[PDB]
Design a protein around this ligand. Structure first.
Ligand SMILES: [Ca+2]
Length: 185
DNA sequence: ACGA
């Protein structure tokens, strides 16, 4: 009955206490959720360099193409509805550096919109593939960034959740290893 | 030493 939901954020930068979410994406088997958001703060140059995302006035741009955004409230509610209705089981989140990056950001933004407790009512745990991969390949790999891992074993949050799901499938982590890198939301 |  459990279902893994791989998720990923694109953001305005690296400050987890203040950055806004620019893209929220998730995949659970074949089901895909992905939305762009118009940020409420500036996208740092470093972030634009990594993602190609930037803001032209009130228009979010992926390189030279506008992308459609969804207001924050509706975007976050959509992700909750995905977790509630679309995974066909009891979801557990999975993300790369989720404990120290994605969850602190998403927790903060959810709270800004009064959605944190509804969120926590539909999902309770999260797996961190960064610390998981560092254990599985301890003394084996010298890098554990997701792009490196994808290149070795196989930044747009829709492709990135897909490749994290595939990495996880290749790695085939045992339940005991997974539990070792699971934290409570 | 990872994330944007
Ligand atoms: Ca990520």
């Amino acid at each position: 009955e459990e279902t893994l939901v791989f998720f990923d954020l694109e953001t305005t930068g690296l400050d987890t206490s203040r950055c806004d979410i620019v893209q929220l994406s998730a995949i659970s088997g074949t089901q895909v959720f992905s939305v762009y958001l118009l940020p409420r703060c500036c996208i740092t140059e470093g972030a634009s360099q990594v993602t190609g995302l930037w803001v032209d006035g009130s228009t979010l741009m992926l390189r030279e193409r506008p992308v459609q955004t969804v207001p924050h409230q509706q975007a976050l509610t959509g992700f909750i509805r995905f977790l509630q209705n679309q995974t066909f089981g009891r979801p557990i989140l999975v993300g790369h550096n989720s404990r120290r990056f994605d969850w602190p950001i998403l927790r903060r933004v959810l709270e800004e919109f009064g959605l944190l407790q509804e969120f926590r009512s539909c999902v309770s745990e999260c797996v961190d593939t960064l610390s998981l991969s560092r254990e599985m390949f301890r003394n084996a790999l010298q890098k554990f960034s997701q792009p490196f891992l994808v290149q070795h074993f196989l930044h747009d949050a829709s492709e990135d959740v897909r490749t994290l799901q595939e990495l996880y499938r290749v790695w085939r982590p045992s339940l005991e290893l997974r539990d070792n890198h699971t934290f409570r939301l």
